Amino acid sequence: QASEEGINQEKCINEEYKIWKKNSPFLYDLIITRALEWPCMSLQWYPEQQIFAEHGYTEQKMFLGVRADVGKYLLAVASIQLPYLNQLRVNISNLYSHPESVCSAKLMPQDDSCVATVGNYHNDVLVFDKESFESYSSASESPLKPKYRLTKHTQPCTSVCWNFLSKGTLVSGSQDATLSCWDLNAYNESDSASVLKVHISSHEKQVSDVRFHYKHQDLLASVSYDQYLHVHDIRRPDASTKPARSVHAHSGPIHSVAFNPHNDFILATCSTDKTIALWDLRNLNQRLHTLEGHEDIVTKISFSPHEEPILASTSADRRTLVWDLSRIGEDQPAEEAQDGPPELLFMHGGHTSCTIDMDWCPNYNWTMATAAEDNILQIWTPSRSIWG
Amino acid sequence: NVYINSYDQSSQSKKQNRTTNWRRWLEANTDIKFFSETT
Amino acid sequence: QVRQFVSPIISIDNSALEPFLNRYPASESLFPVTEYEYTPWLEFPLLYSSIGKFVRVTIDIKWLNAAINPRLCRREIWGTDVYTDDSDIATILAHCGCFSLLKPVRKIAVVDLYILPPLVHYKGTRKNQIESRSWSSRQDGISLKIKEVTWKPACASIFENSIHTLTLEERLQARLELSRSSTFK
Helix, coil or strand: residue A135: helix
Number of neighbours of residue C56 by Cβ within 10 angstroms? 17
Could you tell me which residues come within 8 angstroms of residue C83 by beta carbon, excluding any fewer than 6 positions away?
A: C77, C92, C122, C132, C143, C144, C145
Please state, in angstroms and rounded to a whole number, the distance separating the CA atoms of residues A239 and A217.
15
Pick the closest to residue A245 from B31, C154, C42 (CA basis): B31
The dihedral through the CA atoms of C57, C62, C65, C69 has a sign that is negative
Burial of A287 (0-12, 13-18, 19+ CB in 10 A): middle
Which residue type is seen at A259? F
* SS3 call for A128: strand
Give the 3-state secondary structure of chain C: CCCCCCCCCCCCCCCCCHHHHCCCCCCCCCCCCCEEECCCCCCCCCCHHHCCCEEEEEECCHHHCCCCCCHHHHCCCEECCCEECCCCHHHHHHHCCCCCCCCCCCCCEEEEEEEECCCCCECCCEECCEECECECCCCCCCEEEEEEEEECCCCCCCHHHHCCCCCHHHHHHHHHHHCCCCCCC
Please give the Cα distance from A207 to A225 (Å, whole number): 6
Residues with Cβ within 8 Å of residue A75, at least 6 apart in sequence: A63, A64, A65, A66, A94, A95, A96, A97, A98, A102, A105, A115, A117
Distance CA C127, CA C136 (A): 20
Q: Is A140 helix (H, G, I), strand (E, B) or coil?
A: coil
Element (H, E) at A277: strand A276-280
Contacts of residue A39, defined as CB under 8 A and 6 or more positions apart, other chains included, come to: A66, A67, A356, A373, A375, C172, C175
Subunits next to B (3 or more Cβ pairs <8 Å) are A
Buried b / exposed e along A95-119 (16+ C-beta atoms within 10 A) = ebbbbbbbbbbbbbeeebebbbbbb
∠ CA C117-C120-C123 to the nearest 5 degrees? 105
The DSSP secondary structure of A24-85, one letter per residue, reads GGGTEEEEEEEE-SS-EEEEEEEEEEEEETTTTEEEEEEEEEEESSSS-EEEEEEEEEEE--
Residue A224 CB neighbour total at 10 angstroms: 22
Q: Which amino acid is at C59?
A: I
CB within 8 Å: A120 and C175: no
Angle at C122 (CA atoms; ends C119, C125), nearest 5 degrees: 150
Q: How far apart are CA A116 and CA A172, in angstroms?
A: 10
Residues of B21-33 as b/e, b for ≥16 C-beta within 10 angstroms? bbeeeeeeebeeb
Burial class (CB in 10 A: 0-12, 13-18, 19+), A354: buried
- CA distances, A372 to each of A281, A282, A303 (Å): 33, 37, 19
Query: Residue A14: phi, psi to the nearest 5?
Result: -50, -40
Sheet with A310-315, strands from edge to edge, namely A298-303, A310-315, A320-324, A344-348
Interface test with A, best of C99, C163, C172, C177 (most A CBs within 10 A): C172
Closest approach of chain B CAs to the CA of A177, in angstroms?
22
Contact between chains at A325 and B22 (C-beta distance less than 8 A): yes
Q: Which of C164, C167, C171 is the best mutation test for A, with the most CBs of A within 10 A?
A: C164
Sign of the dihedral defined by the CA atoms of residues C37, C40, C43, C47, in that order: positive
Please tell me the number of Cα atoms within 13 Å of B9 on its side-chain side.
0
- Are chains C and B in touch, 3+ Cβ pairs below 8 Å? no
User: Is residue A317 helix, strand or coil?
Assistant: coil
Bridge partners for A381 per DSSP: A30
Q: Which of C47, C52, C33, C53 is nearest to C86 (CA)?
A: C47
Residue A18, chain B, CB below 8 Å: the answer is no
Distances (CA, A) of C172 to A20, A65, A95, A220, A373: 24, 15, 21, 32, 7
Sheet holding A179-183, edge to edge: A157-162, A169-174, A179-183, A196-200
d(CA C47, CA C44): 8
- At B10, phi and psi to the nearest 5? -60, -45
d(CA A209, CA A269): 10
Helices (H), A303-383: none
With beta carbons less than 8 A apart as the criterion, state whether A206 and A224 touch.
yes
CA atoms within 13 A of residue C155's CA, in its CB half-sphere: 15
Q: What are phi and psi of C179, to 5 degrees?
A: -70, -10
Secondary structure class of A97 (helix, strand, coil): strand
Per the CB < 8 A criterion, the answer to whether A169 and A141 are in contact is: no
CB pair distance less than 8 Å for C158 and A13: no
Task: Name every chain A residue with its beta carbon within 8 A of the beta carbon of B23.
Answer: none
Question: In angstroms, what CA-CA distances link A156 with A126, A153, A325, C46?
Answer: 12, 7, 36, 67
* Last residue before each break in chain A (C–N > 2.5 Å): 87
Torsional sign, CA C53, C59, C64, C65: negative
Report the candidate in C104, C103, C94 with the shortest Cα–Cα distance to residue C149. C94
Q: Between chain A and chain B, are at least 3 CB pairs below 8 A?
A: yes
Instruction: Supply φ then ψ for residue A6, to 5 degrees.
Output: -60, -40
Is B17 at the interface with chain A, CB within 8 A?
yes
A4 vs chain B: nearest CA distance in angstroms? 32
Alpha-carbon distance of A42 to C47, in angstroms, equals 64
Strand partners, A269: A257, A277
Q: Record the resolution, in angstroms.
A: 3.2
For the purposes of burial, counting CB atoms within 10 Å of the CB of A376, is it exposed (0-12), middle (13-18) or buried (19 or more)?
buried
Burial of A368: CB neighbours in 10 Å, binned 0-12, 13-18, 19+: buried
Q: CB-based contacts of A224: which residues, under 8 Å, 6+ apart?
A: A177, A203, A204, A205, A206, A207, A208, A230, A253, A254
SS3 for chain B is CEEECCCCHHHHHHHHHHHHHHHHHHCCHHHHHHHHHCC
With contacts defined as CB-CB under 8 Å, which chain A residues touch B1? 31-34
What are the percentages of helix, strand and coil residues in chain A, rounded to 5?
10, 45, 45
Give dist(CA A39, CA A34) in Å, integer: 12
Please give, rounded to a whole number of angstroms, the shortest distance from the CA of B27 to a CA of chain A.
9
Angle (nearest 5°) at CA A172 between A169 and A176: 155
What are residue A35's DSSP bridge partners? A376
Of the candidates A172, A181, A127, the one whose C-alpha atom is nearest the C-alpha of residue A154 is A172
First to last CA, chain C: 66
Amino acid letter for position A225? Y
Angle at A5 between CA A3 and CA A10, to 5 degrees: 90
Torsion of CA A244, A248, A253, A255, to 10 degrees: -50
- The three state secondary structure string of C74-119 is HCCCEECCCEECCCCHHHHHHHCCCCCCCCCCCCCEEEEEEEECCC
Query: How far lies A321's CA from each of A24, A169, A173, A377, C158, in Å?
Result: 16, 32, 27, 17, 20
Chain B: closest CA distance from residue A12 (Å) = 22
Query: Residue A288 in contact with residue A249, Cβ under 8 Å?
Result: no
